[PDB]
Design a protein around this ligand. Structure first.
Ligand SMILES: COC(=O)[C@H]1O[C@H](O[C@@H]2[C@H](O)[C@@H](O)[C@H](O[C@@H]3[C@H](O)[C@@H](O)[C@@H](O[C@@H]4[C@H](O)[C@@H](O)[C@@H](O[C@@H]5[C@H](O)[C@@H](O)[C@@H](O[C@@H]6[C@H](O)[C@@H](O)[C@@H](O)O[C@@H]6C(=O)OC)O[C@@H]5C(=O)O)O[C@@H]4C(=O)O)O[C@@H]3C(=O)O)O[C@@H]2C(=O)O)[C@H](O)[C@@H](O)[C@H]1O
Length: 342
């Protein structure tokens, strides 16, 4: 028995429906009773911020129900200020017990077109992060099933509590799954995209950039998934599995890269094509303003039973034991939360 509180559609011949997703979400009564919105096929050019608990979106199909907007971190607002990375997100989840099912969420910032612009072009953006989906510090228990997330740099920003991604597609280039959240991915395709602007022999991107606090048990956990190249033009050994993001953070003694953001990315039973070379380092600014490098060997970067041509076992790619792997079950990673759909 499944019923919808609101329906969104492009058609006026459809009937008693909302024309925008934002209107349907806003129509929800104040409170925390479940509110479920059906979104009929179409491309909805909208930016959304979810602040109501227990809100659920269901698209007609992943292929055909699309929420999309184009915003880069370096895109300017009316007051002349930049949106910033967090501010660039197409969808922002700042509530508990959110779910989205059978829909695509895109940031349509045309990264390749931007990079192709002449260096003297004033419209060429340097701050090229363009987030599709952002789960904030206020988000916990966010569930995404049969969802496609589209972007280049910084596609998925997972902060705050626990999120679960199931039967998913996520595409991107540089740090396309990043943040300090507990984010579990099961049976998703992680799609590394072609970079026309990267020279032969240089790195095209990094799947993950975790900023997991050292005291937090789980960061980014990827299980039973596929790490795939977008095309045969994506070179061998062009993508890192992860690099350690130590976010610029305001402390009592200044603003600098967080020393305690010692990120975790763990891959279990995941296929990898040969575009994967292994893990990588990442730079930030220290308390004195100097460049500081954070190394993968000092980070919580692990694999368990990877397979496919990108799945090499060396001293630079630490492996879990069977006993250690058992600590990364859904039950342990998500704790007392069982992700459920309405
Ligand atoms: C607690 O107090 C309150 O109650 C306040 O609440 C409100 O505030 C909001 C918000 O809720 C709050 O969290 C926040 O704060 C600051 C900051 O203002 C904000 O800009 C944001 O920053 C993120 C990130 O945390 C930063 O580290 C930094 O990250 C950059 C870069 O943007 C990011 O993409 C990445 O880039 C790497 C690499 O470094 C780069 O070279 C390139 O290669 O790309 C890489 C990549 O793509 O990786 C993903 O890392 C960079 C870095 O410097 O490390 O900027 C980010 C951004 O711009 O979004 O979050 C900060 C935080 O620490 O929380 O403040 C806001 C606000 O005030 O607007 C109320 O509004 C307020 O009044 C209070 O009441």
């Amino acid at each position: 028995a499944t019923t919808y509180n609101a329906v969104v559609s492009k058609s006026s011949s459809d009937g008693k429906t909302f024309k925008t997703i934002a209107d349907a979400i806003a129509s929800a009564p104040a409170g925390s009773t479940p509110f479920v919105i059906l979104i009929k096929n179409g491309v909805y050019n909208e930016r959304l911020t979810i602040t109501r608990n227990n809100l659920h979106l269901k698209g007609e199909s992943r292929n055909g129900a699309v929420i999309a907007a184009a915003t880069a971190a370096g895109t300017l607002k009316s007051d002349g200020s930049k949106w910033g990375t967090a501010g660039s997100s197409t969808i922002t989840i700042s509530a508990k017990d959110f779910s989205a099912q059978s829909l695509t969420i895109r940031n349509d910032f045309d990264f390749p077109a931007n990079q192709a612009k002449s260096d003297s072009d004033s419209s060429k953006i340097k701050d090229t992060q363009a987030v599709a989906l952002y789960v904030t510090k206020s988000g916990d228990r966010a569930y995404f099933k049969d969802v496609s997330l589209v972007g280049y740099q910084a596609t998925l920003y997972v902060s705050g509590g626990r999120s679960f991604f199931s039967d998913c597609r996520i595409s991107g280039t540089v740090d396309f799954i990043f943040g300090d959240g507990t984010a579990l991915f099961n049976n998703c395709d992680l799609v590394s995209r072609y970079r026309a602007d990267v020279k032969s022999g240089n790195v095209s991107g990094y799947l993950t950039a975790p900023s997991t606090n050292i005291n937090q048990k789980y960061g980014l956990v990827i299980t039973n998934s596929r790490v795939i190249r977008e095309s045969d033009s994506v070179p061998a050994k062009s993508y890192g599995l992860g690099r350690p993001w130590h976010p610029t953070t305001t402390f009592s003694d200044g603003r600098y890269a967080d020393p305690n953001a010692i990120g975790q990315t763990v891959f279990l039973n995941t296929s990898m094509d040969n575009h994967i070379y292994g893990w990588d380092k990442m730079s930030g600014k220290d308390k004195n303003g100097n460049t500081i490098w954070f190394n993968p060997e000092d980070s919580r970067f692990f694999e368990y039973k990877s397979y496919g041509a990108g799945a090499t076992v060396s001293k630079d790619r630490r492996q879990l034991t069977d006993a250690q792997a058992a600590e990364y079950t859904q039950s342990k990673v998500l704790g007392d939360w069982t992700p459920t759909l309405p």
